[PDB]
């Protein structure tokens, strides 16, 4: 009944770790803030933070949820793993929490609007 993230398949019980669950339509398409923020195809439109949610192109987020159905996580093997390593040919791709667990590096630059993941092989 209650909504769950279209990426990681969990609802509001993981809001603190994965970011607030946002709901996008009456079919309960939804995503935690970090799950959508780092999704490779999510288009950000204005400055964002956890304190002040920015503007995003929600159509791109819904497209990413759809793509996610095809994307098995590098760590857990379940679908919805749309946070791909930034290095173009790298196959590693994650759910947000799985990337943390598998020692990926998350890069954030709030002023430039840069949010990306580098896997453990591309961490430098
Ligand atoms: Zn999520
Ligand atoms: Zn996973
Ligand atoms: Zn990589």
Curated annotation (Swiss-Prot):
Organism: Homo sapiens (Human)
Expressing tissues: Ubiquitously expressed.
Function in brief: Transcriptional regulator that associates with ribosomal RNA promoters and suppresses ribosomal RNA (rRNA) transcription.
Zinc finger (PHD-type): 71-123
Chain ranges of zinc fingers (C2HC pre-PHD-type): 2-42
Position of the Glycyl lysine isopeptide (Lys-Gly) (interchain with G-Cter in SUMO2) cross-link: 20
Domain notes: The PHD-type zinc finger 1 mediates both nucleolar localization and interaction with UBTF. The ePHD2 domain folds as an integrated structural module comprizing the C2HC pre-PHD-type 2 zinc finger and the PHD-type 2 zinc finger. It mediates non-specific binding to dsDNA, but doesn't bind histones in contrast to many PHD-type zinc fingers.
Location of region: Extended PHD2 domain (ePHD2): 2-123
Highest taxon of source: Eukaryota
Name of the protein in question: PHD finger protein 6
Quaternary structure annotation from Swiss-Prot or TrEMBL: Interacts with UBTF. Interacts with the NuRD complex component RBBP4 (via the nucleolar localization motif), the interaction mediates transcriptional repression activity.
Disease: Boerjeson-Forssman-Lehmann syndrome: An X-linked recessive disorder characterized by moderate to severe intellectual disability, epilepsy, hypogonadism, hypometabolism, obesity with marked gynecomastia, swelling of subcutaneous tissue of the face, narrow palpebral fissure and large but not deformed ears.
Compartments reported by the entry: Nucleus; Nucleus, Nucleolus; Chromosome, Centromere, Kinetochore
